[PDB]
Design a protein around this ligand. Structure first.
Ligand code: FAD
Ligand code: FAD
Ligand code: FUM
Ligand code: FUM
Ligand code: CA
Ligand code: CA
Lengths: 655, 655
């Protein structure tokens, strides 16, 4: 048998995984990072919008702080998040930005002077004073009143990922690519590592560690239309689920993006850098003002996606061989001034859409984009399976609830990498494990036998058409608008699809470097993940955040102010087991109310929300009278934990 | 922490260790071989005499079989060996030779024709028939009536070692050199591996395995004068001893060689290939005929060593700056015929002694040569510490008792590698271990702290003079002739030496590639090994095999027909704990009697020996009358075990 040992095993080489590896390696814990691909090619590298952090450097960031960022996050989550985790996040984001700056990330900086446009109306000139010069700049992104999205020109995710990966190399972290975790080794409710398949040689290897962290990203690829890389298939989520003990949280909470290029899914950051992009229908008609007279195209992205679908169902969409879509027109610009970098989007359209934005319109359609759901953890990042941690998009640490704030996800990846990294390191240093060879051999030989059965299978099903059928079902029935009848049917077909995946047969019999063998074991995993999303969507009879039930259009704070927990106890069951974790209103710093976007008064009020709200109002007014600061008032409303390393305050311009 | 795992851990890259690694690796068990030096430089490579195996190919080997080889072995051991183990050995030796032949070992072959000399007297012409042509040849070595020592010209150990090492490379055995095992990891009476120090980088690493085998060779270097390589220091024996559970067997049983070059210890195989070498004293007098009128120089090597010491104590030795010695004269030859290879010894004398044998005489003195003693195991090669095996000179499997048969040791290395290899493989495949990180960390950090204390020690003792003082004490008091008074004093000085070794201080403070640090931890280990030998020699009040007590000149089969078992239970004690394992006369195929060499009737007879002897005589005569064969008679006298793979009979010329 082949066995590799390390003190801290990290599964996933994205921003979250690499940052967590830095935390453990810097304290002498031997650490290995496993990844399907070279870590610098992870999906994190595609982030072009930016990272959210309340620095308060620029004019449009003036007066920003943890409280304001916290509020935007909670309301955005439509009260589905763990508010304490959100506090840990907003408080730590500023220091994540600054640490990366010290690591060389070339953040765009502020320079003295005036700027034009970049505003909805009224004002149009921005002035950056001399004392702001040279500090990290910010842009308007995510729809927050205060501009706090930091960026390194047009490749933020890329420069961030490279810096964290370089730090790993500097520290001597062991990075092993083209290696895939296909199962978790566990016994007596404890995780002792993972069974790994070497994608090149085909060897099945056991990686044992005192602690294991899963930072495998999202599961967007279960949908046909997604912005996600080809590797975001949710297998990290699946192996966690297949332990029969670790639980998945809010898998039904999927976020879409309104303007990806159709049908590729390639992101056109059009209308971002400089608002001007106009959405048009089949008649060239600018429809957004018809649904949103005030906000128009600048409405909440959440709203824009819905309106685009509504307009298409109204029969005003453009027909094409790949389905219906709409138009994105930016030609209305095609020129400006200079003094800084502002030229990219055209290339995307020319290289793929095969056209110049300044001339023709780009085809677009809302597509899957982010996965709020993931492995359920406590505030420390540990799952119900002891010794198993998770961070990043792969987790449901839950600072996102039912709607992630634009710019908060790449931020969570690094922030969670820092925080969960500390708790993960602590666990790995203090815990003591019993590594039984009997258990190791069982899991290892079990996967070798599994690989052999797949290669020897005389099944007649085709893995590719089963995977494609799954993606269609998810897109057609588990998208922006959902209803019981269709969810019912999708769940039924997915379950049927899952049973057929077990009768797959492949042509290539080799055990090494086999793309076909890879699909044969990954698809069944993706189907289990899909079932959790679909079934979770069917049973959740309410509309919350990105989850919209046309048959239950209102947010039900009485029966659904909770979190969906999915598990798969019996390896033979064909449907996930769903449970619910209720959110304690008393443990909230901000009581449930209007989320700030979408229709008004569209939620069933919970008597306790009113009760808690009054208490909050009272507790604040009093302490505020006694001349107590926001830090003391926050602590009185909802105390939260932070590891020693990060409990310091964040210095801001003009304290 | 750094941890390496494998199914089978082999400590020692000599003939025994490498052959055992082949046995485990060939059955899919991942195996690692640890060695201080590149394996092909192990002491096994110095063997020039040959390997003993009853092939029965040549004229002078005619009629040889397992029984004859068995008898020579038992009588040679002076009844101190486990006769069942000896049976396993002689039966398997023929197949070890043949397997090596299939592996390319260039054994010298027989050719049709006549040969001269190579005889004591009477006959002088040997004829090899045509049906013997092309088969593996044999020479006169070890004093056995039947010539059964196989050889590849003048470099038998070398070609054998290379072939076994090459087979390891072929199978992909993981060979890690410049790596030293400094402690064994154990818990609840089970061995889970070893703590290893990387001689190059200085890293302390834990190698864990389901089974661990120690094949680290002899401990000849505790003596000042030895034929052994500079690395035969007994540290493998020591780490076994320091577990407080594994036991050492007959450590006092040390064999000397009569004619190594003085004072280097370089072996002069003079008088071997072609008898002619004459021993002379300070007056040029040929003294051997004075003590042994009949056998003269051709007497048992055991006897020659004693006479040489006697002659020196008689004041007829040669004085030199390095001590007293005698002369070896081969000039009496310096010429012959041809038809085969016969030229080497001269070079040894010219390159080191700086002289031509055909002219001047070579200085010689008996020196330590072989270690019968070693780690005590059962017939399977497993020690009292479960999961810990041992094979080769490092073990006391005990087929040697108190006197190894010339040519049997290189034979045991390979044979034990084959047999113990099978049992070791079986153990590794069937056992299941509980690897606790708490236990691993304890042993690893314990050795790191130990290394740190050595480097930080402000002690004033000099490790080199303490090691040199030890070697002198061993040579002066624990040599060919021993007596209670001197052994008493040596044990006392060794114990005192051991206490001072703990107050050593070194100049070079680095943790990597540090020769001085190496001595600081190896010397204390050597001292514990020396103490076992010395104390074992003092308490054994009898003369047996190579162990000679001038105050107890007789072999006592009544009170000492047993084996000395040494242990070190309390890590704080300064003297080993000695126990005895009695040899059951009823479990013997050959009852105790005259060993065949040395003075007649020099042993206290045991009433049970006579009882058992009669029973043997009876059981044989009867079964022989019934026309039963030697195989059936042997089984009726003393049945023994052999793994399935080697229980077949050995085909011989003319069956
Ligand atoms: C898709 C996307 C997302 C995105 C964005 C633009 C695009 C096109 N722009 C963003 C922005 O401007 N601001 C923002 O806040 N977020 C933005 N996002 C989303 C964001 O980039 C992601 O949420 C974030 O990068 C996720 O980081 P994370 O570290 O969690 O994960 P990752 O980068 O996807 O990497 C996953 C790693 O896991 C390895 N892996 C996966 N499965 C396995 C298995 N089974 N075994 C071994 N390794 C595995 C992958 O190889 C990878 O390295
Ligand atoms: C010294 C000698 C012995 C000898 C001989 C000639 C000389 C000069 N001629 C012989 C002959 O003609 N016929 C015969 O039957 N025997 C003869 N012998 C004795 C014989 O060669 C030995 O008994 C035999 O070769 C021993 O083999 P074994 O496999 O047991 O051991 P080795 O070759 O000495 O190798 C020991 C290995 O252990 C490694 N080692 C030692 N300590 C450690 C620690 N602490 N950690 C890691 N590795 C360790 C050594 O590096 C080596 O590889
Ligand atoms: O619109 C974008 O380019 C990125 C959005 C994201 O933060 O997910
Ligand atoms: O006399 C020799 O060369 C070797 C003797 C040995 O077998 O130990
Ligand atoms: Ca998630
Ligand atoms: Ca021995």
């Amino acid at each position: 048998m082949k066995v590799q040992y390390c003190d801290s095993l990290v599964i996933g080489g994205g921003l979250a995984g690499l940052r967590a590896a830095v935390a453990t390696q810097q304290k002498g814990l031997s650490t290995i990072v496993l990844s399907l691909i070279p870590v610098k090619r992870s999906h994190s590298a595609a982030a072009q919008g930016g990272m959210q952090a309340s620095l308060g450097n620029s004019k449009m960031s003036d007066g920003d702080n943890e409280d304001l960022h916290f509020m935007d996050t909670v309301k955005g989550s439509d009260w589905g998040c763990d508010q304490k985790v959100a506090r840990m996040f907003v408080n730590t984001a500023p220091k994540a930005i600054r640490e990366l700056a010290a690591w060389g990330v070339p953040w765009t900086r502020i320079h003295k002077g005036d700027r034009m446009a970049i505003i909805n109306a009224q004002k149009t000139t921005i002035t950056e004073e001399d004392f702001r010069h040279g500090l990290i700049h910010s842009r308007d992104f995510g729809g927050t009143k205060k501009w706090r999205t930091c960026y390194t020109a047009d490749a933020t995710g890329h420069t961030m990922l490279f810096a964290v990966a370089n730090e790993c190399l500097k520290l001597g972290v062991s990075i092993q690519d083209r290696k895939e975790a296909i199962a978790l080794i566990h016994q007596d409710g404890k995780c002792y590592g993972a069974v790994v398949r070497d994608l090149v040689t085909g060897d099945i290897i056991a990686y044992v560690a005192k602690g294991t962290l899963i930072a495998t990203g999202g599961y967007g690829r279960i949908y046909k239309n997604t912005t996600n890389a080809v590797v975001c298939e949710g297998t990290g989520t699946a192996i966690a689920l297949e332990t029969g003990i670790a639980q998945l949280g809010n898998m039904e909470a999927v976020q879409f993006h309104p303007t990806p290029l159709f049908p590729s899914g390639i992101l056109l950051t059009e209308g971002c850098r400089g608002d001007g992009g106009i959405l048009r229908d089949v008649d060239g008609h600018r429809f957004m003002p018809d649904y949103e007279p005030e906000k128009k195209e600048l409405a909440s992205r959440d709203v824009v996606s819905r309106r685009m679908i509504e307009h298409i169902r109204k029969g005003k969409g453009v027909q094409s061989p790949y389905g219906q879509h709409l138009w994105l027109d930016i030609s209305i610009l095609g020129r400006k001034h200079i003094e800084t970098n502002l030229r990219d989007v055209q290339e995307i359209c020319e290289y793929f859409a095969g056209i110049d934005p300044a001339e023709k319109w780009a085809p677009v359609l809302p597509m899957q984009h982010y996965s709020m759901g993931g492995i359920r953890t406590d505030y420390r990042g540990e799952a119900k399976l002891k010794g198993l941690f998770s961070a990043g998009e792969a987790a449901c640490w839950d600072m996102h609830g039912f709607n992630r704030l634009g710019g908060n996800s790449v931020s969570e990846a690094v922030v969670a990498g820092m925080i969960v990294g500390e708790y993960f390191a602590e666990h790995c240093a203090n815990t003591q494990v019993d590594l039984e060879t009997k258990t190791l051999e069982k899991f290892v030989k079990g996967q070798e036998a599994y690989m052999k059965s797949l290669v020897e299978s005389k099944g007649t099903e085709d893995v590719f058409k089963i995977k494609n059928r799954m993606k269609d079902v998810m897109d057609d029935n588990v998208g922006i608008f959902r209803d019981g009848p269709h969810l019912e049917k999708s769940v039924k077909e997915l379950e049927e699809l899952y049973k057929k995946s077990k009768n797959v047969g492949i042509k290539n019999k080799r055990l090494h470097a086999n793309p076909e063998l890879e699909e044969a074991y990954r698809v069944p995993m993706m189907l289990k993940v899909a079932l959790c999303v679909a079934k979770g969507a069917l049973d959740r009879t309410e509309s919350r955040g990105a989850h919209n039930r046309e048959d239950y259009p209102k947010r039900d704070d009485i029966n659904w102010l909770n979190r969906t927990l999915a598990s798969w106890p019996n390896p033979e069951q064909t449907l996930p087991t769903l449970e619910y974790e209720a959110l304690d209103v008393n443990e909230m710093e901000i009581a449930p109310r209007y989320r700030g976007y979408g229709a008004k008064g569209n939620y069933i009020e919970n008597p306790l929300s009113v009760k808690r709200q009054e208490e909050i109002d009272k507790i604040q007014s009093e302490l505020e009278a006694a001349g107590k600061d926001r830090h003391a008032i926050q602590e009185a409303l909802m105390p939260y934990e932070l590891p020693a390393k990060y409990k310091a305050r964040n210095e801001r311009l003009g304290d």
